Short mmCIF file of all heavy atoms in Angstrom, two decimals:
data_model
loop_
_atom_site.label_atom_id
_atom_site.label_comp_id
_atom_site.label_asym_id
_atom_site.label_seq_id
_atom_site.Cartn_x
_atom_site.Cartn_y
_atom_site.Cartn_z
N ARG A 1 -1.54 -10.13 -5.69
CA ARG A 1 -0.47 -11.09 -5.87
C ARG A 1 0.62 -10.56 -6.81
O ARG A 1 1.79 -10.84 -6.59
CB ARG A 1 -1.03 -12.44 -6.31
CG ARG A 1 -1.81 -13.06 -5.16
CD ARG A 1 -2.35 -14.42 -5.50
NE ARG A 1 -2.89 -15.05 -4.29
CZ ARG A 1 -3.31 -16.30 -4.19
NH1 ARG A 1 -3.23 -17.12 -5.22
NH2 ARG A 1 -3.82 -16.73 -3.04
N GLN A 2 0.22 -9.79 -7.83
CA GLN A 2 1.17 -9.10 -8.70
C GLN A 2 2.00 -8.10 -7.90
O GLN A 2 3.21 -8.05 -8.09
CB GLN A 2 0.45 -8.36 -9.82
CG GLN A 2 -0.15 -9.29 -10.87
CD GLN A 2 -1.05 -8.54 -11.83
OE1 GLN A 2 -0.65 -7.54 -12.43
NE2 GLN A 2 -2.29 -8.99 -11.95
N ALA A 3 1.35 -7.31 -7.04
CA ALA A 3 2.04 -6.39 -6.15
C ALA A 3 2.95 -7.13 -5.17
O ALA A 3 4.07 -6.68 -4.93
CB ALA A 3 1.05 -5.51 -5.42
N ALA A 4 2.48 -8.26 -4.63
CA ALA A 4 3.24 -9.08 -3.69
C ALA A 4 4.52 -9.64 -4.32
O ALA A 4 5.48 -9.90 -3.60
CB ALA A 4 2.37 -10.20 -3.17
N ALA A 5 4.53 -9.85 -5.65
CA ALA A 5 5.73 -10.25 -6.37
C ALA A 5 6.79 -9.14 -6.40
O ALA A 5 7.96 -9.45 -6.60
CB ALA A 5 5.37 -10.70 -7.76
N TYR A 6 6.39 -7.87 -6.23
CA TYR A 6 7.29 -6.73 -6.34
C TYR A 6 7.63 -6.13 -4.98
O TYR A 6 8.79 -5.80 -4.74
CB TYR A 6 6.68 -5.67 -7.26
CG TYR A 6 7.74 -4.76 -7.85
CD1 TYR A 6 8.53 -5.19 -8.91
CD2 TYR A 6 7.99 -3.49 -7.33
CE1 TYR A 6 9.52 -4.38 -9.45
CE2 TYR A 6 8.98 -2.67 -7.86
CZ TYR A 6 9.74 -3.12 -8.93
OH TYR A 6 10.73 -2.36 -9.47
N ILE A 7 6.63 -5.94 -4.10
CA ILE A 7 6.81 -5.22 -2.85
C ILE A 7 7.56 -6.09 -1.85
O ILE A 7 7.42 -7.32 -1.86
CB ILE A 7 5.45 -4.69 -2.33
CG1 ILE A 7 4.98 -3.57 -3.27
CG2 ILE A 7 5.49 -4.23 -0.87
CD1 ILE A 7 3.65 -2.96 -2.94
N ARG A 8 8.39 -5.44 -1.02
CA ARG A 8 9.17 -6.11 0.00
C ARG A 8 8.31 -6.38 1.23
O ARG A 8 7.40 -5.61 1.53
CB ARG A 8 10.37 -5.25 0.43
CG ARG A 8 11.34 -4.87 -0.67
CD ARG A 8 11.94 -6.11 -1.30
NE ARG A 8 13.15 -5.85 -2.08
CZ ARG A 8 13.83 -6.75 -2.77
NH1 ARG A 8 13.41 -8.02 -2.84
NH2 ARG A 8 14.94 -6.39 -3.40
N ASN A 9 8.65 -7.45 1.96
CA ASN A 9 7.97 -7.83 3.19
C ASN A 9 8.54 -6.98 4.33
O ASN A 9 9.42 -7.43 5.06
CB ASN A 9 8.07 -9.33 3.43
CG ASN A 9 7.45 -10.11 2.29
OD1 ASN A 9 6.27 -9.90 1.97
ND2 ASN A 9 8.20 -11.00 1.66
N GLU A 10 8.02 -5.75 4.46
CA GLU A 10 8.46 -4.79 5.46
C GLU A 10 7.26 -4.17 6.16
O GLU A 10 6.19 -4.04 5.57
CB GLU A 10 9.32 -3.70 4.80
CG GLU A 10 10.64 -4.23 4.27
CD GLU A 10 11.59 -3.17 3.75
OE1 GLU A 10 12.15 -2.42 4.58
OE2 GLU A 10 11.78 -3.10 2.51
N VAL A 11 7.47 -3.77 7.42
CA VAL A 11 6.42 -3.24 8.28
C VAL A 11 6.20 -1.78 7.90
O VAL A 11 7.13 -0.98 7.98
CB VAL A 11 6.77 -3.38 9.77
CG1 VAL A 11 5.67 -2.85 10.68
CG2 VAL A 11 7.11 -4.83 10.15
N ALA A 12 4.96 -1.44 7.49
CA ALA A 12 4.57 -0.07 7.21
C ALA A 12 4.25 0.67 8.50
O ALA A 12 4.76 1.77 8.72
CB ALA A 12 3.38 -0.05 6.27
N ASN A 13 3.40 0.06 9.34
CA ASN A 13 2.96 0.63 10.61
C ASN A 13 3.13 -0.43 11.70
O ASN A 13 2.44 -1.45 11.66
CB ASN A 13 1.53 1.15 10.49
CG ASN A 13 1.13 2.12 11.58
OD1 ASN A 13 1.81 2.26 12.61
ND2 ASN A 13 0.01 2.80 11.39
N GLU A 14 4.07 -0.20 12.63
CA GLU A 14 4.39 -1.15 13.69
C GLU A 14 3.26 -1.26 14.72
O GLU A 14 3.10 -2.32 15.32
CB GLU A 14 5.69 -0.75 14.41
CG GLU A 14 6.92 -0.76 13.50
CD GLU A 14 8.23 -0.50 14.22
OE1 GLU A 14 8.36 0.59 14.82
OE2 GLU A 14 9.12 -1.38 14.18
N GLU A 15 2.51 -0.16 14.92
CA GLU A 15 1.41 -0.11 15.87
C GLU A 15 0.27 -1.04 15.44
O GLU A 15 -0.18 -1.87 16.24
CB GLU A 15 0.89 1.32 16.01
CG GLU A 15 1.90 2.29 16.63
CD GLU A 15 1.51 3.75 16.51
OE1 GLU A 15 1.42 4.24 15.36
OE2 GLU A 15 1.31 4.41 17.55
N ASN A 16 -0.17 -0.90 14.18
CA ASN A 16 -1.26 -1.68 13.62
C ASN A 16 -0.81 -3.05 13.10
O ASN A 16 -1.67 -3.88 12.81
CB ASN A 16 -1.96 -0.92 12.50
CG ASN A 16 -2.52 0.41 12.95
OD1 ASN A 16 -2.15 1.45 12.41
ND2 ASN A 16 -3.42 0.39 13.93
N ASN A 17 0.51 -3.27 12.97
CA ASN A 17 1.09 -4.46 12.36
C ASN A 17 0.65 -4.56 10.90
O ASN A 17 0.15 -5.60 10.46
CB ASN A 17 0.83 -5.73 13.18
CG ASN A 17 1.43 -5.67 14.56
OD1 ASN A 17 2.48 -6.28 14.81
ND2 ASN A 17 0.80 -4.96 15.48
N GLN A 18 0.86 -3.47 10.15
CA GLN A 18 0.48 -3.35 8.75
C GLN A 18 1.74 -3.50 7.90
O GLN A 18 2.72 -2.79 8.12
CB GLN A 18 -0.17 -1.98 8.54
CG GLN A 18 -0.83 -1.81 7.17
CD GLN A 18 -1.29 -0.40 6.90
OE1 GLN A 18 -0.52 0.56 7.04
NE2 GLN A 18 -2.54 -0.24 6.50
N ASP A 19 1.70 -4.42 6.92
CA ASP A 19 2.76 -4.57 5.93
C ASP A 19 2.66 -3.47 4.88
O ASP A 19 1.63 -2.81 4.75
CB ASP A 19 2.72 -5.95 5.29
CG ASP A 19 3.02 -7.11 6.22
OD1 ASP A 19 2.21 -7.36 7.14
OD2 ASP A 19 4.08 -7.77 6.02
N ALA A 20 3.74 -3.31 4.10
CA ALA A 20 3.79 -2.36 3.00
C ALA A 20 2.74 -2.69 1.94
O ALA A 20 2.10 -1.78 1.42
CB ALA A 20 5.17 -2.32 2.40
N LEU A 21 2.57 -3.99 1.63
CA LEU A 21 1.56 -4.45 0.69
C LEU A 21 0.16 -4.10 1.18
O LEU A 21 -0.69 -3.72 0.37
CB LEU A 21 1.69 -5.96 0.45
CG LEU A 21 0.75 -6.57 -0.59
CD1 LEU A 21 0.97 -6.01 -1.98
CD2 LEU A 21 0.92 -8.08 -0.60
N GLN A 22 -0.09 -4.27 2.49
CA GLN A 22 -1.38 -3.96 3.08
C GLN A 22 -1.67 -2.46 3.05
O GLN A 22 -2.81 -2.08 2.81
CB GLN A 22 -1.47 -4.50 4.51
CG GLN A 22 -1.46 -6.02 4.58
CD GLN A 22 -1.41 -6.55 5.99
OE1 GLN A 22 -0.60 -6.09 6.81
NE2 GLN A 22 -2.26 -7.51 6.30
N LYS A 23 -0.64 -1.63 3.30
CA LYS A 23 -0.77 -0.18 3.22
C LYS A 23 -1.10 0.25 1.79
O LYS A 23 -1.92 1.15 1.60
CB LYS A 23 0.48 0.54 3.72
CG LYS A 23 0.37 2.06 3.78
CD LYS A 23 1.56 2.78 4.38
CE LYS A 23 1.43 4.26 4.25
NZ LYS A 23 2.60 4.96 4.77
N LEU A 24 -0.44 -0.36 0.79
CA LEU A 24 -0.68 -0.05 -0.61
C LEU A 24 -2.15 -0.28 -0.97
O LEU A 24 -2.74 0.56 -1.64
CB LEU A 24 0.23 -0.86 -1.53
CG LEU A 24 0.07 -0.60 -3.03
CD1 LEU A 24 0.58 0.77 -3.41
CD2 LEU A 24 0.73 -1.66 -3.88
N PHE A 25 -2.71 -1.42 -0.54
CA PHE A 25 -4.06 -1.81 -0.90
C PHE A 25 -5.11 -1.17 0.01
O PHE A 25 -6.27 -1.11 -0.39
CB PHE A 25 -4.15 -3.34 -0.96
CG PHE A 25 -3.68 -3.86 -2.31
CD1 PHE A 25 -2.34 -3.77 -2.68
CD2 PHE A 25 -4.59 -4.35 -3.24
CE1 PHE A 25 -1.91 -4.20 -3.93
CE2 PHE A 25 -4.16 -4.79 -4.49
CZ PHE A 25 -2.83 -4.70 -4.84
N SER A 26 -4.72 -0.71 1.21
CA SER A 26 -5.63 -0.03 2.13
C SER A 26 -5.56 1.49 1.93
O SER A 26 -6.45 2.06 1.31
CB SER A 26 -5.36 -0.42 3.56
OG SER A 26 -5.56 -1.81 3.76
N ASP A 27 -4.48 2.11 2.43
CA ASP A 27 -4.44 3.55 2.65
C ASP A 27 -4.11 4.30 1.36
O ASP A 27 -4.74 5.32 1.09
CB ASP A 27 -3.44 3.90 3.75
CG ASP A 27 -3.69 3.21 5.09
OD1 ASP A 27 -4.85 3.26 5.57
OD2 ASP A 27 -2.74 2.62 5.64
N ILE A 28 -3.14 3.79 0.58
CA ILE A 28 -2.67 4.46 -0.62
C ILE A 28 -3.75 4.40 -1.70
O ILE A 28 -4.05 5.41 -2.33
CB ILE A 28 -1.34 3.87 -1.12
CG1 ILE A 28 -0.24 3.86 -0.04
CG2 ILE A 28 -0.85 4.60 -2.38
CD1 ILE A 28 0.05 5.20 0.59
N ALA A 29 -4.32 3.20 -1.92
CA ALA A 29 -5.38 2.98 -2.90
C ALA A 29 -6.61 3.85 -2.62
O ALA A 29 -7.22 4.35 -3.56
CB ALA A 29 -5.75 1.51 -2.93
N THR A 30 -6.96 4.02 -1.33
CA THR A 30 -8.09 4.83 -0.92
C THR A 30 -7.83 6.31 -1.22
O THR A 30 -8.71 6.99 -1.72
CB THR A 30 -8.38 4.58 0.56
OG1 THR A 30 -8.72 3.20 0.63
CG2 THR A 30 -9.55 5.39 1.09
N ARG A 31 -6.61 6.77 -0.89
CA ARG A 31 -6.22 8.16 -1.08
C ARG A 31 -6.30 8.59 -2.55
O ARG A 31 -6.68 9.73 -2.81
CB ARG A 31 -4.80 8.41 -0.55
CG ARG A 31 -4.55 9.87 -0.17
CD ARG A 31 -3.09 10.27 -0.25
NE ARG A 31 -2.17 9.44 0.53
CZ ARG A 31 -0.86 9.63 0.67
NH1 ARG A 31 -0.25 10.71 0.18
NH2 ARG A 31 -0.14 8.74 1.34
N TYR A 32 -5.96 7.68 -3.48
CA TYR A 32 -5.87 7.99 -4.90
C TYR A 32 -7.00 7.34 -5.70
O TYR A 32 -6.79 6.98 -6.86
CB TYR A 32 -4.49 7.52 -5.37
CG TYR A 32 -3.35 8.30 -4.74
CD1 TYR A 32 -2.32 7.66 -4.05
CD2 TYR A 32 -3.32 9.68 -4.80
CE1 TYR A 32 -1.30 8.38 -3.46
CE2 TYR A 32 -2.31 10.42 -4.21
CZ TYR A 32 -1.29 9.76 -3.55
OH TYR A 32 -0.31 10.52 -2.98
N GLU A 33 -8.20 7.24 -5.11
CA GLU A 33 -9.33 6.60 -5.77
C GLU A 33 -9.79 7.44 -6.96
O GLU A 33 -10.03 6.88 -8.04
CB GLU A 33 -10.47 6.34 -4.78
CG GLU A 33 -11.53 5.39 -5.32
CD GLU A 33 -12.56 4.90 -4.32
OE1 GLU A 33 -12.54 5.32 -3.14
OE2 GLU A 33 -13.41 4.08 -4.73
N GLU A 34 -9.88 8.77 -6.78
CA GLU A 34 -10.42 9.68 -7.78
C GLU A 34 -9.34 10.28 -8.69
O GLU A 34 -9.68 10.85 -9.72
CB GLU A 34 -11.21 10.78 -7.08
CG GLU A 34 -12.43 10.26 -6.33
CD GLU A 34 -13.37 11.30 -5.75
OE1 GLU A 34 -13.16 12.52 -5.95
OE2 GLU A 34 -14.34 10.89 -5.07
N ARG A 35 -8.05 10.16 -8.32
CA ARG A 35 -6.95 10.70 -9.10
C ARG A 35 -6.57 9.72 -10.21
O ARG A 35 -6.38 8.54 -9.92
CB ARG A 35 -5.77 10.98 -8.17
CG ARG A 35 -4.59 11.69 -8.83
CD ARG A 35 -3.45 11.88 -7.86
NE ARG A 35 -3.74 12.95 -6.90
CZ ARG A 35 -3.66 14.26 -7.12
NH1 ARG A 35 -3.20 14.73 -8.28
NH2 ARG A 35 -3.99 15.11 -6.16
N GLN A 36 -6.43 10.21 -11.45
CA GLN A 36 -6.10 9.39 -12.61
C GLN A 36 -4.64 9.63 -12.99
O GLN A 36 -4.33 10.54 -13.75
CB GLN A 36 -7.06 9.68 -13.77
CG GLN A 36 -8.54 9.67 -13.39
CD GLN A 36 -8.96 8.44 -12.62
OE1 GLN A 36 -8.60 7.31 -12.97
NE2 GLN A 36 -9.69 8.64 -11.53
N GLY A 37 -3.74 8.80 -12.43
CA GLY A 37 -2.31 8.90 -12.67
C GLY A 37 -1.67 10.06 -11.90
O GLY A 37 -2.35 10.84 -11.24
N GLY A 38 -0.33 10.13 -11.96
CA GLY A 38 0.44 11.20 -11.33
C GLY A 38 0.32 11.17 -9.81
O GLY A 38 -0.03 12.18 -9.20
N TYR A 39 0.63 10.01 -9.23
CA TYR A 39 0.53 9.80 -7.79
C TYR A 39 1.76 10.33 -7.06
O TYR A 39 1.69 10.51 -5.85
CB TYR A 39 0.35 8.31 -7.51
CG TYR A 39 -0.81 7.73 -8.30
CD1 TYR A 39 -0.62 6.70 -9.21
CD2 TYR A 39 -2.09 8.28 -8.20
CE1 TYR A 39 -1.67 6.19 -9.96
CE2 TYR A 39 -3.15 7.77 -8.93
CZ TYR A 39 -2.94 6.73 -9.81
OH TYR A 39 -3.98 6.24 -10.55
#
C-alpha cells in the first residue's frame, strides 16, 4: 500500500495484464532477494 501510494497505475506486461506495482512485488522483488541495496 505504501508502494501503491507512489507507483503509477500503468501496465508493465500487456500479455499477462501485470501492473507496475504487481511487477515490483513479483519479478523485481524476486530478482533482488539476496542483493543488499544497489539495485
Side-chain angles (χ1 to χ4, degrees):
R1 290 182 171 188
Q2 289 170 54
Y6 203 78
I7 290 179
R8 301 300 197 183
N9 300 304
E10 293 186 72
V11 181
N13 198 346
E14 297 185 300
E15 294 168 297
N16 301 121
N17 298 257
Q18 190 189 51
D19 294 67
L21 184 62
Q22 293 174 313
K23 185 175 173 183
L24 180 70
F25 276 69
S26 298
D27 304 310
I28 306 304
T30 298
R31 204 206 305 183
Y32 295 125
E33 194 170 3
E34 297 187 4
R35 186 182 285 282
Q36 311 310 314
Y39 307 119

